[PDB]
Design a protein around this ligand. Structure first.
Ligand SMILES: Nc1ccc2ccccc2n1
Ligand SMILES: [Cl-]
Ligand SMILES: [Cl-]
Ligand SMILES: [Zn+2]
Ligand SMILES: [Zn+2]
Length: 124
């Protein structure tokens, strides 16, 4: 209820933007909205980050940059290269977590074997 710009400004200027958003969520803060939801059939591979939407029946698909805290905050990505894994791609979010795609991508890691989210889609 505070608004996306209010939350994103708070996280953007924090020394640790990821910790700012995680602590905000843990405090009961309403997730960031206005992520770009994709029209899909839910018959996809269910892999986490894809060239085209790949949601299975347990997922929703979103535009990648819209679900990236660093993209949404207009700040550098936290790696030497400043590379973004999500920009220009589509991200599959478990339906149970799809009320907060930005928090989900921030908190989770892609399985290097099967390419699905560890602890969710991944069955390795
Ligand atoms: N995951 C999933 C399955 C079926 C849907 C139907 C309509 C909207 C969203 C859906 N999501
Ligand atoms: Cl907005
Ligand atoms: Cl998943
Ligand atoms: Zn990004
Ligand atoms: Zn796996």
């Amino acid at each position: 209820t505070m608004g996306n710009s209010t939350v994103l400004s708070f996280c953007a200027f924090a020394v640790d933007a990821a910790k700012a958003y995680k602590d905000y969520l843990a405090s009961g803060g309403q997730p960031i909205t206005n992520c770009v939801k994709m029209l899909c059939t839910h018959t996809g591979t269910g892999q986490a980050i894809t060239v085209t939407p790949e949601a299975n029946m347990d997922q929703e698909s979103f535009g990648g940059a819209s679900c990236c805290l660093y993209c949404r905050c207009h700040i550098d990505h936290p790696n030497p290269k400043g590379f973004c894994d999500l920009k220009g791609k589509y991200v599959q979010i478990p339906t149970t977590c799809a009320n907060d795609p930005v928090g989900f991508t921030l908190k989770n890691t892609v399985c290097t074997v099967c390419g699905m989210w560890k602890g969710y889609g991944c069955s390795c």
